[PDB]
């Protein structure tokens, strides 16, 4: 590893690729939302995690989980993507932003309202 060596072949960095190609390094993207599924989770866990195939604006048919209990996404439901991989759901590296666009928000929610988009209850 003598100096010379490095002088002729300098140290090489790397190119850690984005774990989520939401393109242009955008905080969020809009999608048409093709279909809505309920695939089963991975190995250790078991349930019916509700996911949906969205069609991003730039044209990147990806998937995204629907946090919170109960949603309302149907067919041509315009929604926003957040980007948050889900372990029990392979292929799912994004999260559908709740409360935004055509996507509603978790009702009856109280604790942690910001997430799942929910305005203050009342008083």
């Amino acid at each position: 590893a003598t100096v010379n060596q490095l002088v002729r072949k300098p140290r090489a960095r790397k190119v850690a690729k984005s774990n989520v190609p939401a393109l242009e390094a955008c905080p969020q993207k809009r999608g048409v939302c093709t279909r809505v599924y309920t695939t089963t989770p991975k190995k250790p866990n078991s349930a019916l995690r509700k996911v949906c195939r969205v069609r991003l604006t730039n044209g990147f048919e990806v998937t995204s989980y629907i946090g919170g209990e109960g949603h309302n996404l149907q067919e041509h439901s315009v929604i926003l993507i957040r980007g948050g991989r889900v372990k029990d759901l392979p292929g799912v590296r994004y999260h559908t932003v709740r409360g935004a666009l055509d996507c509603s928000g978790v009702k009856d929610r109280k604790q942690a309202r910001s997430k799942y988009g929910v305005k203050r209850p009342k008083a």
């Binding site: 100096v3 010379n4 490095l6 002088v7």
Partner: protein, 80 residues
Amino acid sequence: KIRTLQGRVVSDKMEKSIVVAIERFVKHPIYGKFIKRTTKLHVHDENNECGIGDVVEIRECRPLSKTKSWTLVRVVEKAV
């Protein structure tokens, strides 16, 4: 006085033209180690007085021509 670099002639196949090399130390901007770099200039030899290998000396001047702006001042060795 004037600055003049001396170097060994690497090429002499042009009319009045001559290619000369010039070695030069340099500290690595991160390794310290001094490396011997070389520069290739196309000095002007109107008299063809100097030949190949001849350690000649030259100075900067008016652009006598493209890729040519240095004129030979005097030879310092008639090649080995």
